Protein backbone atom coordinates (compact mmCIF):
# COMPACT_ATOMS: atom_id res chain seq x y z
CA UNK A 1 0.00 0.00 0.00
CA UNK A 2 1.21 3.51 -1.00
CA UNK A 3 1.93 6.07 1.76
CA UNK A 4 1.21 9.84 1.90
CA UNK A 5 2.97 11.86 4.69
CA UNK A 6 2.94 9.08 7.33
CA UNK A 7 -0.51 7.66 6.52
CA UNK A 8 -1.70 4.67 4.42
CA UNK A 9 -3.55 5.70 1.19
CA UNK A 10 -4.50 2.29 -0.26
CA UNK A 11 -6.19 3.15 -3.61
CA UNK A 12 -4.20 1.16 -6.18
CA UNK A 13 -3.91 -0.28 -8.77
CA UNK A 14 -6.50 1.92 -10.54
CA UNK A 15 -5.22 5.13 -8.88
CA UNK A 16 -1.50 5.95 -8.97
CA UNK A 17 0.95 8.92 -8.74
CA UNK A 18 -0.55 10.31 -5.48
CA UNK A 19 0.00 13.92 -4.41
CA UNK A 20 -1.20 15.46 -1.14
CA UNK A 21 -3.79 18.26 -1.66
CA UNK A 22 -4.87 19.10 1.87
CA UNK A 23 -6.98 18.29 4.87
CA UNK A 24 -10.73 18.02 4.45
CA UNK A 25 -13.35 17.87 7.24
CA UNK A 26 -12.85 14.09 7.64
CA UNK A 27 -9.16 13.67 6.76
CA UNK A 28 -6.48 13.67 4.11
CA UNK A 29 -7.32 14.37 0.48
CA UNK A 30 -4.95 13.40 -2.38
CA UNK A 31 -4.97 13.77 -6.12
CA UNK A 32 -4.23 10.64 -8.17
CA UNK A 33 -4.02 9.52 -11.75
CA UNK A 34 -7.03 7.38 -12.73
CA UNK A 35 -5.47 4.74 -15.01
CA UNK A 36 -8.92 3.88 -16.46
CA UNK A 37 -10.35 7.34 -17.31
CA UNK A 38 -6.76 8.72 -17.89
CA UNK A 39 -7.29 11.90 -15.82
CA UNK A 40 -6.25 13.11 -12.38
CA UNK A 41 -8.95 12.79 -9.68
CA UNK A 42 -9.38 13.75 -6.02
CA UNK A 43 -9.46 11.00 -3.35
CA UNK A 44 -10.73 11.62 0.21
CA UNK A 45 -9.78 9.03 2.92
CA UNK A 46 -12.42 8.55 5.63
CA UNK A 47 -11.87 6.40 8.78
CA UNK A 48 -15.24 6.68 10.65
CA UNK A 49 -16.13 3.32 12.15
CA UNK A 50 -14.99 3.90 15.75
CA UNK A 51 -17.53 6.70 16.32
CA UNK A 52 -21.30 6.70 15.73
CA UNK A 53 -21.34 10.44 14.77
CA UNK A 54 -18.53 9.90 12.19
CA UNK A 55 -20.54 6.96 10.72
CA UNK A 56 -23.72 9.13 10.49
CA UNK A 57 -21.90 11.91 8.65
CA UNK A 58 -20.12 9.52 6.23
CA UNK A 59 -23.38 7.67 5.50
CA UNK A 60 -25.19 10.97 4.72
CA UNK A 61 -22.40 12.19 2.42
CA UNK A 62 -22.42 8.92 0.41
CA UNK A 63 -26.21 8.25 0.24
CA UNK A 64 -26.90 11.86 -0.78
CA UNK A 65 -24.13 12.21 -3.39
CA UNK A 66 -24.98 8.83 -4.98
CA UNK A 67 -28.67 9.88 -5.42
CA UNK A 68 -27.87 13.34 -6.74
CA UNK A 69 -26.94 13.87 -10.36
CA UNK A 70 -26.39 17.54 -11.24
CA UNK A 71 -23.71 19.61 -13.05
CA UNK A 72 -23.35 21.94 -10.00
CA UNK A 73 -23.04 19.16 -7.35
CA UNK A 74 -19.75 17.22 -6.94
CA UNK A 75 -20.41 13.61 -7.83
CA UNK A 76 -18.89 10.44 -6.43
CA UNK A 77 -17.00 8.74 -9.25
CA UNK A 78 -15.89 5.69 -7.27
CA UNK A 79 -15.67 4.39 -3.70
CA UNK A 80 -12.77 2.17 -2.63
CA UNK A 81 -13.06 -0.15 0.36
CA UNK A 82 -12.18 -3.67 1.49
CA UNK A 83 -14.28 -6.59 0.09
CA UNK A 84 -15.69 -7.52 3.52
CA UNK A 85 -17.19 -5.64 6.45
CA UNK A 86 -14.56 -7.28 8.76
CA UNK A 87 -11.61 -5.91 6.70
CA UNK A 88 -13.17 -2.44 6.05
CA UNK A 89 -11.37 0.10 8.28
CA UNK A 90 -11.34 3.06 5.83
CA UNK A 91 -13.38 4.23 2.83
CA UNK A 92 -11.86 6.24 -0.06
CA UNK A 93 -14.20 8.51 -2.03
CA UNK A 94 -13.08 9.44 -5.55
CA UNK A 95 -14.31 12.73 -7.05
CA UNK A 96 -13.56 15.03 -9.98
CA UNK A 97 -10.36 16.98 -9.36
CA UNK A 98 -11.10 20.69 -9.15
CA UNK A 99 -8.62 23.59 -9.51
CA UNK A 100 -9.55 25.48 -6.31
CA UNK A 101 -12.35 26.33 -3.83
CA UNK A 102 -14.12 29.63 -3.43
CA UNK A 103 -12.47 30.06 0.04
CA UNK A 104 -8.98 30.00 -1.47
CA UNK A 105 -10.01 32.12 -4.44
CA UNK A 106 -11.51 34.86 -2.17
CA UNK A 107 -8.24 35.00 -0.15
CA UNK A 108 -6.18 36.13 -3.18
CA UNK A 109 -8.38 37.12 -6.16
CA UNK A 110 -10.66 40.04 -6.94
CA UNK A 111 -13.82 38.73 -8.65
CA UNK A 112 -15.23 40.67 -11.65
CA UNK A 113 -19.04 41.40 -11.53
CA UNK A 114 -19.29 38.78 -14.36
CA UNK A 115 -17.63 36.05 -12.22
CA UNK A 116 -19.85 36.96 -9.20
CA UNK A 117 -23.01 36.69 -11.32
CA UNK A 118 -21.91 33.35 -12.89
CA UNK A 119 -20.82 31.85 -9.54
CA UNK A 120 -24.09 32.95 -7.83
CA UNK A 121 -26.14 31.52 -10.72
CA UNK A 122 -24.37 28.16 -10.39
CA UNK A 123 -24.73 28.05 -6.59
CA UNK A 124 -28.47 28.80 -6.91
CA UNK A 125 -28.85 26.30 -9.80
CA UNK A 126 -27.34 23.54 -7.62
CA UNK A 127 -29.33 24.68 -4.57
CA UNK A 128 -32.59 24.52 -6.61
CA UNK A 129 -31.94 20.81 -7.29
CA UNK A 130 -30.95 20.09 -3.65
CA UNK A 131 -34.05 21.87 -2.29
CA UNK A 132 -36.28 20.18 -4.92
CA UNK A 133 -35.07 16.85 -3.34
CA UNK A 134 -36.42 18.15 0.03
CA UNK A 135 -32.79 18.33 1.30
CA UNK A 136 -31.09 21.20 3.18
CA UNK A 137 -27.32 21.41 2.73
CA UNK A 138 -26.90 23.26 6.10
CA UNK A 139 -23.16 24.03 5.67
CA UNK A 140 -22.92 26.26 2.62
CA UNK A 141 -19.75 28.32 2.74
CA UNK A 142 -16.91 29.27 0.37
CA UNK A 143 -14.73 26.23 1.28
CA UNK A 144 -17.65 23.97 0.21
CA UNK A 145 -17.77 25.39 -3.33
CA UNK A 146 -15.24 23.87 -5.71
CA UNK A 147 -14.15 25.50 -8.97
CA UNK A 148 -12.48 24.04 -12.10
CA UNK A 149 -10.20 26.02 -14.54
CA UNK A 150 -13.19 27.34 -16.56
CA UNK A 151 -15.01 28.59 -13.42
CA UNK A 152 -17.56 25.73 -13.39
CA UNK A 153 -18.80 25.53 -9.79
CA UNK A 154 -19.68 22.37 -7.76
CA UNK A 155 -21.29 22.26 -4.33
CA UNK A 156 -19.68 19.72 -2.07
CA UNK A 157 -19.94 18.10 1.43
CA UNK A 158 -23.41 16.86 2.23
CA UNK A 159 -22.29 15.36 5.58
CA UNK A 160 -24.33 17.88 7.63
CA UNK A 161 -27.42 17.81 5.32
CA UNK A 162 -30.94 17.04 6.56
CA UNK A 163 -34.36 16.34 5.04
CA UNK A 164 -36.42 19.60 5.39
CA UNK A 165 -38.96 19.51 8.26
CA UNK A 166 -40.60 23.02 8.65
CA UNK A 167 -43.25 21.71 11.13
CA UNK A 168 -40.60 20.70 13.72
CA UNK A 169 -38.30 23.75 13.20
CA UNK A 170 -39.14 25.66 16.44
CA UNK A 171 -36.79 25.54 19.45
CA UNK A 172 -35.51 27.60 22.39
CA UNK A 173 -33.15 30.55 22.50
CA UNK A 174 -29.33 29.93 22.17
CA UNK A 175 -29.59 26.18 21.73
CA UNK A 176 -28.83 25.48 18.05
CA UNK A 177 -25.47 25.11 16.31
CA UNK A 178 -26.35 24.69 12.59
CA UNK A 179 -23.85 25.69 9.86
CA UNK A 180 -20.46 27.34 10.21
CA UNK A 181 -20.77 30.47 12.40
CA UNK A 182 -20.22 33.20 9.80
CA UNK A 183 -22.90 31.68 7.51
CA UNK A 184 -25.52 30.91 10.18
CA UNK A 185 -28.98 32.53 9.78
CA UNK A 186 -30.11 34.76 12.72
CA UNK A 187 -33.05 32.46 13.55
CA UNK A 188 -30.57 29.63 14.49
CA UNK A 189 -29.58 31.66 17.57
CA UNK A 190 -33.16 32.63 18.34
CA UNK A 191 -35.76 29.92 17.69
CA UNK A 192 -34.84 27.63 14.77
CA UNK A 193 -33.35 24.10 14.52
CA UNK A 194 -32.33 24.86 10.89
CA UNK A 195 -34.88 22.49 9.32
CA UNK A 196 -36.23 24.93 6.67
CA UNK A 197 -34.83 25.83 3.19
CA UNK A 198 -34.45 29.50 4.27
CA UNK A 199 -31.28 28.59 6.26
CA UNK A 200 -29.44 27.76 3.01
CA UNK A 201 -30.62 30.99 1.35
CA UNK A 202 -29.08 33.00 4.23
CA UNK A 203 -25.70 31.19 3.72
CA UNK A 204 -25.87 32.01 0.00
CA UNK A 205 -26.53 35.69 0.83
CA UNK A 206 -23.44 35.61 3.06
CA UNK A 207 -21.41 34.07 0.21
CA UNK A 208 -22.63 36.70 -2.24
CA UNK A 209 -21.61 39.53 0.20
CA UNK A 210 -18.19 37.85 0.60
CA UNK A 211 -17.70 37.67 -3.21
CA UNK A 212 -18.43 41.43 -3.43
CA UNK A 213 -15.79 42.50 -0.88
CA UNK A 214 -13.45 39.45 -0.35
CA UNK A 215 -14.23 39.60 3.40
CA UNK A 216 -16.93 37.76 5.43
CA UNK A 217 -19.87 40.15 6.02
CA UNK A 218 -20.72 38.80 9.52
CA UNK A 219 -17.36 37.69 11.03
CA UNK A 220 -18.57 36.79 14.54
CA UNK A 221 -15.57 36.06 16.80
CA UNK A 222 -17.56 33.35 18.64
CA UNK A 223 -21.19 31.90 18.78
CA UNK A 224 -22.64 34.71 20.86
CA UNK A 225 -21.12 37.53 18.79
CA UNK A 226 -22.74 36.27 15.50
CA UNK A 227 -26.17 37.86 16.08
CA UNK A 228 -24.48 41.20 17.04
CA UNK A 229 -22.70 41.34 13.66
CA UNK A 230 -25.96 40.52 11.83
CA UNK A 231 -27.96 43.22 13.69
CA UNK A 232 -25.04 45.64 13.30
CA UNK A 233 -25.74 45.69 9.52
CA UNK A 234 -29.46 44.77 9.18
CA UNK A 235 -30.44 47.06 12.07
CA UNK A 236 -33.07 46.35 14.72
CA UNK A 237 -35.84 43.90 13.58
CA UNK A 238 -39.25 45.46 12.90
CA UNK A 239 -42.24 44.97 15.15
CA UNK A 240 -43.75 42.62 12.49
CA UNK A 241 -40.58 40.47 12.49
CA UNK A 242 -40.48 40.33 16.33
CA UNK A 243 -44.18 39.22 16.38
CA UNK A 244 -42.99 36.08 14.48
CA UNK A 245 -40.62 35.33 17.45
CA UNK A 246 -43.02 33.97 20.05
CA UNK A 247 -40.43 32.41 22.41
CA UNK A 248 -40.18 34.96 25.26
CA UNK A 249 -36.43 34.52 25.94
CA UNK A 250 -35.53 35.24 22.28
CA UNK A 251 -38.07 38.09 21.94
CA UNK A 252 -36.99 39.82 25.19
CA UNK A 253 -33.34 39.51 24.27
CA UNK A 254 -34.04 41.38 21.03
CA UNK A 255 -36.21 43.95 22.87
CA UNK A 256 -33.42 44.57 25.42
CA UNK A 257 -31.02 45.81 22.74
CA UNK A 258 -30.59 49.51 21.89
CA UNK A 259 -32.14 50.50 18.56
CA UNK A 260 -29.61 49.95 15.68
CA UNK A 261 -30.10 51.43 12.23
CA UNK A 262 -29.69 49.55 8.93
CA UNK A 263 -26.33 50.05 7.17
CA UNK A 264 -27.17 50.62 3.45
CA UNK A 265 -25.79 47.93 1.15
CA UNK A 266 -24.62 50.62 -1.31
CA UNK A 267 -22.40 52.15 1.45
CA UNK A 268 -20.98 48.74 2.40
CA UNK A 269 -20.38 47.77 -1.27
CA UNK A 270 -19.87 50.97 -3.35
CA UNK A 271 -18.42 49.07 -6.36
CA UNK A 272 -21.32 46.49 -6.41
CA UNK A 273 -23.89 46.15 -9.21
CA UNK A 274 -27.18 47.70 -7.95
CA UNK A 275 -29.10 44.54 -9.06
CA UNK A 276 -26.66 42.38 -7.01
CA UNK A 277 -27.43 44.53 -3.94
CA UNK A 278 -31.23 44.24 -4.42
CA UNK A 279 -30.87 40.43 -4.52
CA UNK A 280 -28.44 40.41 -1.56
CA UNK A 281 -31.06 42.37 0.46
CA UNK A 282 -33.75 39.76 -0.32
CA UNK A 283 -31.41 36.86 0.65
CA UNK A 284 -30.22 38.60 3.85
CA UNK A 285 -33.71 39.28 5.17
CA UNK A 286 -34.00 38.85 8.95
CA UNK A 287 -37.48 37.20 8.84
CA UNK A 288 -37.08 33.67 7.33
CA UNK A 289 -40.70 33.67 6.04
CA UNK A 290 -40.02 36.88 4.01
CA UNK A 291 -36.60 35.64 2.78
CA UNK A 292 -36.39 34.96 -0.96
CA UNK A 293 -36.68 31.30 -2.11
CA UNK A 294 -34.17 29.67 -4.47
CA UNK A 295 -36.50 29.69 -7.56
CA UNK A 296 -37.32 33.39 -6.95
CA UNK A 297 -33.62 34.22 -6.61
CA UNK A 298 -32.85 32.50 -9.96
CA UNK A 299 -35.58 34.70 -11.59
CA UNK A 300 -34.11 37.93 -10.12
CA UNK A 301 -33.01 40.58 -12.73
CA UNK A 302 -29.35 40.26 -11.53
CA UNK A 303 -29.34 36.73 -13.04
CA UNK A 304 -31.30 37.52 -16.25
CA UNK A 305 -28.37 36.59 -18.61
CA UNK A 306 -28.39 33.05 -17.21
CA UNK A 307 -32.00 32.40 -16.10
CA UNK A 308 -33.52 29.45 -18.02
CA UNK A 309 -35.97 27.32 -15.95
CA UNK A 310 -35.95 24.50 -18.57
CA UNK A 311 -32.16 24.26 -17.92
CA UNK A 312 -32.40 24.32 -14.09
CA UNK A 313 -33.37 20.74 -13.33
CA UNK A 314 -35.10 19.33 -10.29
CA UNK A 315 -34.60 15.95 -8.59
CA UNK A 316 -36.53 12.98 -9.99
CA UNK A 317 -36.89 11.46 -6.49
CA UNK A 318 -36.89 13.61 -3.30
CA UNK A 319 -35.81 12.23 0.12
CA UNK A 320 -38.71 11.28 2.46
CA UNK A 321 -30.07 9.16 14.64
CA UNK A 322 -29.82 6.33 17.21
CA UNK A 323 -28.57 3.47 14.98
CA UNK A 324 -25.43 1.93 16.63
CA UNK A 325 -22.09 2.36 14.74
CA UNK A 326 -22.24 -1.44 13.90
CA UNK A 327 -25.51 -0.96 11.95
CA UNK A 328 -24.22 2.27 10.28
CA UNK A 329 -21.07 0.34 9.25
CA UNK A 330 -23.33 -2.27 7.51
CA UNK A 331 -25.32 0.53 5.78
CA UNK A 332 -22.12 2.17 4.51
CA UNK A 333 -20.94 -1.28 3.33
CA UNK A 334 -24.27 -1.78 1.41
CA UNK A 335 -24.28 1.76 -0.09
CA UNK A 336 -20.70 1.29 -1.44
CA UNK A 337 -21.23 -2.26 -2.86
CA UNK A 338 -22.04 -0.96 -6.40
CA UNK A 339 -18.37 0.10 -6.88
CA UNK A 340 -16.96 -3.37 -6.22
C1 LIG B 1 -16.09 19.43 -0.73
C2 LIG B 1 -14.98 20.09 0.04
C3 LIG B 1 -13.69 19.31 0.02
O1 LIG B 1 -13.66 18.08 -0.10
N1 LIG B 1 -12.60 20.07 0.13
C4 LIG B 1 -11.25 19.67 0.14
C5 LIG B 1 -10.41 20.11 1.17
C6 LIG B 1 -9.04 19.88 1.10
C7 LIG B 1 -8.50 19.22 0.01
C8 LIG B 1 -9.32 18.74 -1.00
C9 LIG B 1 -10.71 18.94 -0.94
N2 LIG B 1 -11.56 18.40 -1.94
C10 LIG B 1 -11.36 18.49 -3.29
N3 LIG B 1 -10.37 19.28 -3.72
C11 LIG B 1 -10.21 19.38 -5.05
N4 LIG B 1 -9.30 20.28 -5.48
C12 LIG B 1 -8.49 21.13 -4.62
C13 LIG B 1 -7.27 21.65 -5.37
C14 LIG B 1 -6.51 22.60 -4.47
O2 LIG B 1 -7.34 23.69 -4.03
C15 LIG B 1 -8.44 23.20 -3.26
C16 LIG B 1 -9.32 22.30 -4.09
N5 LIG B 1 -10.90 18.72 -6.00
C17 LIG B 1 -11.89 17.93 -5.57
C18 LIG B 1 -12.16 17.80 -4.21
CL1 LIG B 1 -13.43 16.77 -3.68
Amino acid sequence: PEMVRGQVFDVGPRYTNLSYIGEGAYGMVCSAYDNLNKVRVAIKKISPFEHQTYCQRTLREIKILLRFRHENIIGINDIIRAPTIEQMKDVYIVQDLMETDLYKLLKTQHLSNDHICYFLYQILRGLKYIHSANVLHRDLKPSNLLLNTTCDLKICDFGLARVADPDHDHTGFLTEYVATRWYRAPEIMLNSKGYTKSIDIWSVGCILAEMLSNRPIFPGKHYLDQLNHILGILGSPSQEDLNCIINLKARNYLLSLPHKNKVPWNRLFPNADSKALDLLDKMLTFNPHKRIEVEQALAHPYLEQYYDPSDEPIAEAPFKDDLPKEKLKELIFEETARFQ
Side-chain angles (χ1 to χ4, degrees), residues 1 3-6 8-68 70-88 90-98 100-106 108-175 178-220 222-227 229-239 241-266 268-289 291-304 306-319 322-326 328-333 335-340:
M3 211 121 310
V4 185
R5 47 182 70 200
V8 180
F9 218 90
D10 205 10
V11 296
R14 183 173 165 179
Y15 307 100
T16 59
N17 305 91
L18 294 150
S19 176
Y20 180 76
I21 301 166
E23 217 71 27
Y26 264 31
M28 173 159 57
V29 185
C30 292
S31 66
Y33 184 68
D34 177 350
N35 289 273
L36 198 135
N37 292 329
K38 313 290 206 218
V39 289
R40 290 189 70 80
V41 295
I43 310 175
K44 241 157 51 153
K45 174 180 190 195
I46 297 156
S47 313
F49 305 116
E50 282 167 347
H51 298 108
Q52 201 266 5
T53 59
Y54 294 173
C55 291
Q56 276 193 73
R57 187 162 167 175
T58 305
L59 184 57
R60 251 185 282 272
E61 169 78 318
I62 296 169
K63 283 182 86 79
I64 291 165
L65 289 178
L66 292 180
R67 285 263 291 261
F68 289 182
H70 189 283
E71 287 170 357
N72 300 118
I73 300 168
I74 192 73
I76 285 178
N77 296 353
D78 192 7
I79 301 177
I80 302 145
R81 50 95 166 138
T84 65
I85 196 151
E86 296 94 337
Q87 297 168 114
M88 180 176 67
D90 315 293
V91 178
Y92 299 82
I93 308 301
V94 185
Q95 299 179 293
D96 293 346
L97 183 60
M98 302 292 271
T100 190
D101 63 54
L102 186 63
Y103 178 78
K104 290 179 62 258
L105 192 76
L106 291 170
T108 61
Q109 308 296 331
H110 169 77
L111 271 50
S112 69
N113 180 49
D114 288 334
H115 283 87
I116 299 173
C117 194
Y118 187 48
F119 290 162
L120 181 61
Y121 177 67
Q122 296 182 79
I123 296 161
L124 295 164
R125 185 166 183 264
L127 195 61
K128 181 183 169 191
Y129 182 92
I130 299 168
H131 282 185
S132 75
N134 202 39
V135 170
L136 312 178
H137 185 280
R138 301 211 329 157
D139 205 19
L140 294 171
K141 61 182 165 178
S143 62
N144 283 335
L145 300 176
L146 301 169
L147 303 167
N148 68 10
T149 64
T150 48
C151 310
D152 294 311
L153 182 146
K154 293 182 191 287
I155 298 162
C156 71
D157 194 3
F158 285 79
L160 304 84
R162 293 292 185 278
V163 173
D165 188 3
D167 295 347
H168 297 69
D169 188 66
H170 205 281
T171 194
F173 175 55
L174 301 177
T175 176
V178 172
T180 291
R181 190 196 314 140
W182 299 345
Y183 307 91
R184 207 174 264 164
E187 62 269 22
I188 294 309
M189 279 78 77
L190 300 163
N191 64 355
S192 175
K193 287 177 177 174
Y195 296 167
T196 77
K197 292 171 182 183
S198 53
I199 59 115
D200 279 338
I201 294 293
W202 182 271
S203 303
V204 181
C206 289
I207 292 163
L208 172 55
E210 192 162 343
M211 292 192 287
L212 292 168
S213 64
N214 294 86
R215 273 217 51 80
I217 184 175
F218 311 124
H222 56 82
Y223 182 90
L224 298 102
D225 188 40
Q226 196 54 35
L227 191 58
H229 281 263
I230 297 166
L231 305 180
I233 294 301
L234 265 60
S236 296
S238 69
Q239 176 71 251
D241 296 348
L242 282 163
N243 294 336
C244 300
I245 301 180
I246 58 184
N247 181 279
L248 273 166
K249 284 213 271 88
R251 190 190 284 246
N252 286 336
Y253 172 67
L254 293 167
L255 295 172
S256 75
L257 305 165
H259 172 46
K260 306 156 132 99
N261 282 299
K262 184 171 180 65
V263 181
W265 299 117
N266 62 80
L268 278 175
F269 306 110
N271 293 83
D273 185 298
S274 67
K275 286 175 203 191
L277 300 183
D278 188 75
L279 180 49
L280 177 63
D281 184 63
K282 296 175 156 59
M283 298 182 113
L284 296 188
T285 290
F286 177 87
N287 184 342
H289 307 82
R291 200 171 297 145
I292 196 163
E293 292 201 6
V294 68
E295 290 164 304
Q296 284 171 289
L298 283 161
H300 190 276
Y302 181 52
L303 300 176
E304 65 195 301
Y306 298 104
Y307 186 52
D308 184 12
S310 68
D311 191 38
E312 294 153 9
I314 62 169
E316 295 173 13
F319 279 89
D322 52 74
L323 279 177
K325 62 184 174 289
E326 288 83 4
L328 292 159
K329 184 176 197 188
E330 298 172 46
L331 296 174
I332 290 173
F333 186 78
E335 278 296 298
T336 60
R338 74 194 72 185
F339 298 102
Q340 293 291 297

